[PDB]
Amino acid sequence: SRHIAIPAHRGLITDRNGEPLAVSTPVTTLWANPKELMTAKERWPQLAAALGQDTKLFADRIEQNAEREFIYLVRGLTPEQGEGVIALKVPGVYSIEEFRRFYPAGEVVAHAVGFTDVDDRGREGIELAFDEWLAGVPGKRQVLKDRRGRVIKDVQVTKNAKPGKTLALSIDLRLQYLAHRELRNALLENGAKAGSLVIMDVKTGEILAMTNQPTYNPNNRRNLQPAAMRNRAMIDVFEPGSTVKPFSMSAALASGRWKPSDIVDVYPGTLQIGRYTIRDVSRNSRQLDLTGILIKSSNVGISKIAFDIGAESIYSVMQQVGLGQDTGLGFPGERVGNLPNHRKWPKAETATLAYGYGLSVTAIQLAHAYAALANDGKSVPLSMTRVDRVPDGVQVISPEVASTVQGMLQQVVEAQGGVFRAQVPGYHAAGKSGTARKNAYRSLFAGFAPATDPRIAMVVVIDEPSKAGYFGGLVSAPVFSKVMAGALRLMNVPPDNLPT
Ligand SMILES: *C(=O)[C@@H](NC(=O)/C(=N\OC)c1csc(N)n1)[C@@H]1N=C(C(=O)O)C(=C)CS1
16 A cells, blocks of 8 residues: 655754854664564564664564554664664664754853754744744555555655745844853853843834844754743833833923923932832932933932823823833744733822833833933834845834933943943943842843944843842943944944044
């Protein structure tokens, strides 16, 4: 009276410049027909020894499967060892060439690229998200096999196997390597638990780099730490704190009620709402301008503006920029987080929202929001694939307001008492630091550069540094500076810190 398969070649994954990130490698699979093996039991020990398996257990397996016409012996071998096994001429042993992925960049892009399971199907990262694109379609062979199950003849092919298609990611391996190295070093210098760093192109929406620590070698899937396998930029939610204040400020400027030169009274550094007390870390301020509120990261100052303008305006900005919103990336394990909403906002939620307490975002969401702000208020859809034709953006923040806030974030980095460690020598940079209290802290910095014409947005999240420095401007700001400094030269962006 059979229907055997023709493996499809799994589609190549490259970075944006064509560097291979996931490559299908030929392997040899060996299967057997126990009906033939039963006629050649004397050959089994030599075959067993060559496969690794135990002599008596392997013999027990065949004796147990004597009546079956197909069984698997082994599925992953090099074609070097596959040819060595084939040369034994054992009756009933047949071979099939399959594919197993190899990841040339390994740990550098393990979380973004992801990996494949035993069936060459996508399980994590891009491999999973674009499995349909990458997998291709297996084919159906037909062969004449007699009563013994011996493949005697080849009668027909029922379906032709179609290879998967190539996919170019948005990731720039040069930028990915830099962010990976700098984030790892920063975690070691701070003795931190974990970290994430994302770089995005503000003009096209492309994710140029996305790294997390700890990472793993997807070529070493020796069943490592599941926790280490977490793509934190997409699956871990956190309260963004001060890094969300530029969006609260954007709502204030768009309200018509506030200008940067306006003053807010933040004395004595605390603000009471019933049983709840809002508190600033530095409580030696009285009058602060809107830029000063961001520089000093005054929670009181941002709260007073929020009460004046209303939480609805702030909620609308944070929602439209994507905080706690679906990214559209289609990553099955990716987290949306949560953006609290109310019909009538009470005072406590208005203040906490404006200073980012009780909100849940991802590092990718936080970065995308900063990308929209940097892109004069236009939100460009997120993309993990190279973008050749840029989709239309949505104007989420008015150009004037976004431009004004950009200037304010530049003063945060450049002005007296600002986050000078986030300065990117040679360029004008802008950003906002954050420190979230979980005696353990999370240190954040989000920003963009060059301020004169933003090109790149970046988010640096370091979880639980355990050394002396713990402020976002101390722990995460230097990482932004180091990575931003390298990324601008790697993209050949002209330095904008020039003389007047
Ligand atoms: C801004 O992020 C703000 N941080 C906080 O208010 C919090 N803890 O203070 C240490 C917080 C917000 S949500 C949560 N669970 N905890 C001020 N920002 C910074 C900064 O690093 O930018 C400071 C200079 C100190 S606190």
